[PDB]
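User: I'm putting together a small comparison set for a docking exercise, and I want a reference complex before I start. The sequence is below, and the ligand is thiophene-3-carboximidamide. Could you produce the 3D structure with the ligand included, as structure tokens?
Assistant: Of course. I'll restate your input first, then give the structure tokens for the complex.
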Amino acid sequence: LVHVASVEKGRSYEDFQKVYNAIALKLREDDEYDNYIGYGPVLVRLAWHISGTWDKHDNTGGSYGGTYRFKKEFNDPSNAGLQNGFKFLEPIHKEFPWISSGDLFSLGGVTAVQEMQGPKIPWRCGRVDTPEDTTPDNGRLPDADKDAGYVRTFFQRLNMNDREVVALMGAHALGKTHLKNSGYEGGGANNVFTNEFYLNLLNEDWKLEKNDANNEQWDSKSGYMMLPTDYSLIQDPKYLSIVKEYANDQDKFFKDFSKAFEKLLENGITFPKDAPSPFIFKTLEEQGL
Ligand code: HEM
Ligand SMILES: N=C(N)c1ccsc1
């Protein structure tokens, strides 16, 4: 199964920077969302979930087709809460109707990471909307009540290795869980992209508790929380080494996250030899906007 990237007709870097800027300005404007976290974290989660359906074995799923717009995927229990991100992006799509859905959802994640002071994430255009019958079935996204062995095996399907997995999970520095969405009780939350997920894992006094949905999660007296799959990164000796590496080197985490996040967003896509180079967008701050 082959998905060839096809640049939206006549568009170039400046077109996509305009879309980036619209997303970033709206991120700034709609600041009250989710107890003043804003929409940055849910947009990152949206980009991960539309990409995280990919299966390396037959190239089904993945960001290319923009299939989250269809009811089957939109209504995946695993995607509960992402409707807020979709609604956020709706007026952006209305202003720029030429951008494909996959391009918009993935660009939403890149914009959010950068505007939350994360690393630059190079981004490529050319995802093409595919028909409703190409929508992957529910159940391809990961469970949170599992251990390190599960996390490792799960991510092999996305062609991600240990370092990639531990880097991607650092996105859990952002936002929070919501009991009504996932059955996990949210803890302290931030909207600034840092390596503090790793510092929290290593430095907090974690207690295994049961929440009001009767699920186990790890909580600290400081008010932070970790999913069982988060905590599994310091239970497994290979993951633990990498957690310590990123806890002690912010730049290395940023660089590794940027590579893994772009790879995640591009899995499944064949780029022509003469496709444009990846774009690196300027932030609003860098533009003086
Ligand atoms: C084993 C892998 C993963 C599991 C089991 C997992 C599970 C979860 C769960 C249960 C939530 C709470 C959703 C809610 O209640 O609203 C969440 C939130 C989040 N996840 Fe993950 N996740 C995983 C990997 C990732 C990856 C790879 C990324 C991106 C690189 C990511 C980004 C996020 C973000 C940014 C949020 C916060 C969303 C918000 O504040 O609304 N996650 N995750
Ligand atoms: N471990 C956390 N505080 C987390 C998990 C999903 S989003 C934030």
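Residues 172, 175-177, 187, 225-227, 230 surround thiophene-3-carboximidamide (ligand 2) (CB under 6 Å). Residues 177 and 186 are 4 Å apart (CA to CA).
User: Thanks, that's exactly what I needed.
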